[PDB]
């Protein structure tokens, strides 16, 4: 029972993320939360507007035909208040001269519920950028 | 003071991994535990026995002088049972000509208090190799 | 006889992916059916929905002059309910300079005779993407 | 039950061929067994004296440490005559220098139960070659 | 006097591919014909489909200046049914920007006389692609 | 049963080249025999004294392992008399350093009965050439 | 208290340089202030016409999306005239193709209170360049 | 008058670190010292380990000829409490085949007078690392 | 006297080719004339049909300026009936931009006097194409 | 018959250099004989001294293996006093590493009958040069 | 005092230059004036016409905008006829895109006062070309 | 004194060919007159229609600015008919982007007084090209 | 007469650098003298102490064949104290294979006469660094 | 006649410089000679102390087999006491390997006849270095 929930609050932040929704991306996130990923050069980012950009001048703008698919996701329940999942992510996309391609990603999401919601704390990615290559 | 425990085990970690201290590491793991890294190709690897091959082939014959700083370690506490640190760490190094070298990874270690002990449930590593480069 | 109908439901499921029939090639696959492929990066997929992707955006759109040989059909029967198919597929198409180019895959495909149908469970493909280069 | 024993027979076979046991190979094989692999080079191999060069040029001579690891493997089960097995495999192994490398493979094995014993009918094999790089 | 028969069926070959004519190139062949050349890739292909292609894509639509040599023909005789050609030939043709072009292929045809005419039953080309090269 | 006499003598051919036995390959060629291969730089050689010194400086001085399959050999039968050969070879040897390799070549052979005994007129060669690469 | 006095007016100097307000910029330096910098090819500068030319050729004109991150400021009061700020600095910006792109610099800022007024008398940038990268 | 004083304690502690004198160093830096240099891979790091790894590696080892120029030194002078220096500096060596090299950084360094005694707070480096290249 | 009717037939050739008269061309060669030349890739050509090409596609088409110097002939005259000339040829020609180029061949060209007509019955070129670079 | 003689006294000369047999090559040369070549670096050399040099620096000095093919002589008789000959040549001969290899040239000779002895007066070479590569 | 009218002579000349002012120039310039500069290609110039080449075709045209720094000028006085100024010249300049760019050269002057005006008898200059580089 | 004469008709020459005047030219040398130069690939050229090209296809068509420098002349006087000069030469032009540019040529001329009138016999150049580069 | 009294001095201190006599250049030498050479990095150095390294580390030690050759030095007389000195230097010298090479730099050098004696105050160097290229 | 002596007098100066004669050359030569050649670096170089260089560290140590051929020598007398030469020069050597090369260079020789005997004035070499490529 309790994994499906971890999945269900997963796979609606990835639809949040891939729509450009940053109100229901804000919803979900901690106002403290963390970073690792390659777009941060190597550095931990810490709250939400580091983020913020790439809503603003990719994702809200966007609107070519993307696939995602979550593959072999690994579940951790540690109490009632506390998760993390791992998972590897496959994006199908079109590119600048409308072929079909596929990047992978490594990523890694920790979750506590605060006030009876689940939000997220902590990420991290690697592999693929989230701003796909050309 | 709770976060000062976190950085303790966490470098009590890091040590028995530079000793090539199996046994240590072995009590400071979930036998469940998983883990990406750049050796691992993209995938997630679950238990110890990925990890025994580099302590059995390098850590336990390795003597060089090797220096880890964790720099801005950042924490998060989910109740009592449940911790996760996220971290830059160097690592200097003599290479094969005995220069000095310098490496960085991006790591985040997720902890669970299991029978009033503390234990590794899943990590993440990016940028150098646990093997490092010559 | 019975190796002859395993051929005629493999050249049919060709011709349907060649068409961009999705309809024809869901009802040819299982809904559990797995596969290895290099759009894949070297995963292990399941279910239809990564390949609905290059129907709708290439093999529905596409109305170029493309052929395909298959040499050297090796087919093993295991018993009455199953059956294994290996060959060597050729694929002659027209670039985007109009020029015609070959190109070559290995391909294995596992089919289960269900409820009187043969479907789909597994298939392995190596060499040539199926998104065609130029 | 039942894709446990598909696990353990594979688990043996990949054993044998690592400790080049040709002997125990040679009963766990179909003789009209057939493969593809990157040492054949895009060619569909039958019987086992291609394999044979392998074995008695280096896995029967050879005594370096080497490690594997099956993730994710996917089995399917059709009728009490046949199985399916496809996972990823993950080799752990020492260079020329002596420095751990790591490669992977995807690997796709078809079974049929002969006499109430379990042989390979088909194999194919994609990613890193069998005989590993230096 | 009977090596002339051979050159001049093999100079009415070369010049109903030369002019795009399939239904000649039909009557000079043999259904089960096989042959080796560039284009498929090191595989041996059998019957005319494969060639069918060239002609509906390049030799039935090509208008552009192109002179044959034939060099050195030499000549095999083995009984009255059946006759070997081996020789280098020379193509000259102008390029995508009209500059004259050369290029050499080896060629051997293998012919047998069926019901009083002659008729290609193998050939085998090395060197330059048919599909000339700009 | 007649093709089976082809590739019988085919491949006490192959084995009398890969032991340097020039005298049992000089029976087995017609003194007026021609060739394409690599080593011969595109230009059609005959008689066998071109042969001779690959025999001489390599097959009679050699003694490493060398292993070689036939793939696919399809024949044809012209009369009584006369027999054409067409096959992928596959060679499997170890390099400089005892390393197993894997080379592809082309082949096609044209036989006639003199005299009651089969013997090479002609014969075809592409892909790697004879002498191995290191 | 006193340290957030340094991080103000140091944001309110970056927001400055960013609007290409030269004014501001001139009442916030010294006129005896120098600077190390990639712009500077390795000389030390001083005074306020070296930066003149990029306010009036690039931050006056400017008006594309950029923003800015301080991380980690680490501040030194030297009594109660003096101060020093070190930080890494992440700019995201738009390229030349509309494109999202991020630079880090390392920056020093030295602070001395004069006629009861905050003013930079040297600064040291590394890293990125100020004129962003297309 | 003051600025030489500056000056002095200056080449005081480039004499000590080119000695190898980590005693010494460590009575001229502030135990909080930070630093920005290329062997820190742009991060800030904070306290003396990161330096003694250095010092114990190379500069206590070391005994070939070295020459170090200090050009045009900027100081600002803040209060009686507090300085800061700015120079360029120009370092000569022999390489590993005893040929003569030059190298040049640019750096900055902060001073503040505690209980009498002039110490380093920060430093930044810029150019050539410390570890001389070969 | 001998020697200069040996340079004027050779002169009047070089400016029928340049002309693109491969009527007069034709008068000066004999039907059986061969050739080693770099169009023809290191085979002998025999007869004027490989020449022809050249004049219907280049010569008899061309407009532009072109200039050509015979460089220190050497004659061998043979009898009465039979000459030889060596001799280094430089031609000078606008590019495609229309810019001055060189080229420098090496020829040399075998005459026969038949009928009392002075007759080419073989030429050898080096160096420079007849199709000059651009 | 006559062109029998043109191609016996080639033979005997490419025997004599092959020999390093500078006396038997200086009976069968004219002293005023000219020569185009690879080693003359584009210019036409007089006399036999230009190749007395390797004679003396090689042929004399050699006892590698080497084998000569002459493919496809055309011979032109000019009265009864004078010759033309033009073939191809294929070289096999051993590397500095005992592998076989081979080499193409494109040769010309002219000859003349003097005082009823054929001698050259003329040659041009093109492709391989005479000193083999390696 | 004196050092002064020596830095404002300089910046006048440099700033006639910078105009296109070659009638400034030439009072500036003594007429038997020689010069060293990347222009020259390593010779002595001598004279002011090779100058004014850069005049006539680039300073009398341009209109860009442009800025100089003056870096370091030392100044040795000989007397009251005679002296020698060195210094680092920065120029600041739009690229063919407008983008800013940065170029250094080292510059050396020697004047000479004769009838009371000051004029440059020689100079040298290393580093960027005075033509600036896009 | 008589230096200057030779200097004087060297000067006319580089104008007469500066301006395309080929009559003028055609005056000032021996028809029977030789050169060495980059355009005539490493060849001795005699006369003057070699030169009449670039005449005809440059100097006599330009009109774009060029400037030539005379540096360091050299001459020897031998007798009263006869001189050699020696000299380095600089040319100055726009490049076909408007750009000034620098060549650097070597030159030698050999003058002989004839009939009262100086006149070039032999000149040698080295360097750049006469067809200056762009 | 005077100009080679500078001749006289300047070569007396090339002599006394190739010796590696610092004591005779340290006579020469204003003690406040500047330089500008390609192993100061684009700086203005001043004073001996920069140049003593190469003299300790180089002049001192080594005793190889080098030969100098001064061309065309231009000389400057400023007044009776006052001299200016600008020419091209060759250098000749044996490389580590012990092969000639050859060198040239552009050097000016700037004397005054203090208590009657010439001494350097100022020298410019472009070209080939001191430290010679092997 | 007089044409004989000046190829004499060139070809004993040709055999001084290649036995390493730096006593006959200085005879052979003007005292106030000068030289363009590819080891001046484009400068004219004057009298004999450059050329000493190659004699004492080549020319007088060397004992390899060297051959030179002078190609086309055309010869200019001017007057009784005046000539010029120029010629292509082919040298034939060993490589340091022990293997022939062939080099190429063009060179001019004025000669003027003082006191009776005939003298070089000036020389100017082109093509390939003196030192001798390996």
Redesign the interface.
């Known amino acids: 029972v309790r994994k499906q929930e971890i999945i269900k609050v997963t796979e609606q932040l990835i639809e949040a993320i891939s729509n450009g929704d940053f109100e229901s991306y804000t919803k979900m996130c901690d106002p403290g939360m963390?970073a690792?990923e390659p777009?941060?050069?190597?550095?931990?980012?810490?709250g939400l507007?580091?983020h913020r950009?790439?809503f603003?001048?990719?994702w809200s703008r966007n609107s070519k035909?993307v696939?995602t698919?979550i593959?072999?996701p690994?579940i951790?329940l540690?109490?009632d208040?506390?998760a993390?999942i791992?998972?590897?992510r496959?994006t199908?996309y079109?590119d600048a001269g409308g072929?079909?391609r596929?990047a992978?990603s490594?990523e890694?999401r920790?979750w506590?519920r605060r006030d009876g919601k689940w939000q997220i704390?902590?990420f991290?990615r690697?592999?693929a950028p989230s701003?796909l290559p050309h």
Do not use: K, R, W
Request: charge should be negative; proline fraction near 4%; charged fraction near 10%.
């Open positions: 963390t690792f777009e941060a050069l190597g550095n931990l980012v810490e507007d580091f950009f790439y603003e001048n990719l035909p696939h698919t593959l072999n690994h951790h540690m109490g208040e506390s993390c791992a998972y590897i496959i199908q079109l072929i079909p596929t992978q490594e890694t920790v506590h704390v902590h991290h690697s592999g701003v």
